[model samples]
Target: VPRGSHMDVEKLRQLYAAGERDFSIVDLRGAVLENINLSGAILHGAMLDEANLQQANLSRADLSGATLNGADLRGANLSKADLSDAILDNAILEGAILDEAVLNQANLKAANLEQAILSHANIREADLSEANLEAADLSGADLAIADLHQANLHQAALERANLTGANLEDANLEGTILEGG
Candidate 1:
């Protein structure tokens, strides 16, 4: 589909049922897709701003280059998903499971990720300025050269996580756990 093409959940499901995986550039802004299972689906470059995707299962899905600004993704399972180069500025991802997900070069400026799980995830060179990651788990996650200026990470766990060259300028690290190497 082309950019600005509005899509509903039923229409998306129909297309997927017909073996269509390429749904790039479609606009699903404010659409309700809560708890929907879209594992391994391809939706690169799609726009999902303000979409309700809480508790959705997007495991192994391809969301690279997509824009999801202000989308609600609380408790969603996005394990192993590819979100490289995606834009999620100001999105809500509280408690979302992003274990082993690929988020290289993604934009998450000011996004809410409190208590989210990013264990072993790849997030190199991503932008997370002013993001809320309080009590979040980033154990073993790779954040090489990522920008985290002014982000709130109070009580977050970063045990064994790789932060080589990551920018943490003015970021809050109160009570954060970084015990492991």
Candidate 2:
């Protein structure tokens, strides 16, 4: 599986040299596991529909109910990842980190995550409709009942972020910060 600069290093050395750690539900549609690590790996129900995993680390990875449709995971680390109920439609995750991540009920339709960090993330009832999240940080994130229709959140920081019963229809929020809310 060797492809050092990108792709799996000989399928992660033929699945750990045949000792075989649990790489759950593997097919890995469009394989290219750049800088692979798979930190704290479990990969619950993994599929990775269009896998690329650029700069991969997958920090604290679990990937619950994974599908990862059109996956790229650009600049991936996925800090504290769980990704509950993951699907990740049109996934790109432009500069992923996902700090304190859980991503409950995740879907992320039209996902890009332009400059993602997602600090203190839980992302309850996540859908992230038309997701992009430009310059994201999302401090203290919970995002209860999240949707964010037409989501962009330009210049996002979202300090003390909660967005209880969130929708954010036609969301753009140019230079968004949300200092207290």
Candidate 3:
């Protein structure tokens, strides 16, 4: 798939409806997908390594345990999606919307999520080692037991977010908004 090109949503839906499990995992390494609609789809364990999905709508989709390593998801809408235990190592998610999404135990090592929105998302026990999250919004998110080793959170907003037992070892928290107090 080419960058900024429209994917056949109806065709993708029909393929899914037909129970085709092996959908063409386009080696979309660094391909851009802006304004694409993939809502309510199921792509369990799909491999989308290094793809760009800016401003794409993926609400109510099921992408649990999928591998999205090094992907760019800036300004993408992924509200109410299921991404539990998903692998997002080295991914870039600047300004992406993830409200009410489930990402428990997801692997996010070395990811960059600058200014991303994660309100009301469940990310317990997720690995965020060496991730860049400058000015990211994590309000009302549940991040209990999440590993944030060496992560950068400069000027990030974390008001009303749960970080109980979250490992912030060597994490940079310059001007970050902590628990509301």
The candidate maximizing TM-score is 1
TM-score of each: 0.93, 0.33, 0.82
Residue 124 alpha-carbon offset, candidate 2, angstroms: 25
Clash totals in order: 0, 5, 1
Question: Candidate 2: deviation at residue 55, Å?
Answer: 6.8
When summed lDDT is taken over every stretch of 10 residues in candidate 2, the lowest stretch is: 1-10
Per-residue lDDT of model 2, residues 1-181, tens digit only: 2212332447764774565546676656677777778787677776777888897998988888889998899889989989899899889988889899898989988899888899998999899998888888998999998999899898888879998889988888877765224
Q: The CA-based lDDT of model 2 is what? A: 0.82
| Candidate 1 lDDT tens digits, 1-181 | 4456688789888877777778777888898999988888888888888999999999998999999999999999999999999999999999999999999999999999999999999999999999999998999999999998999888888888888999988888887764221
Off by over 4 Å in 3: 1-32, 179-181
Sort by lDDT, top down from the best? 1, 2, 3
Compared with the true structure, the alpha-carbon lDDT of candidate 3 equals 0.78
Any idea how many clashes model 3 has?
A: 1
Q: In model 1, which regions exceed 4 Å deviation?
A: 1-4, 178-181
Regarding TM-score, does 2 or 3 come out ahead?
3
Q: What value does the lDDT take at residue 97 in candidate 3?
A: 88
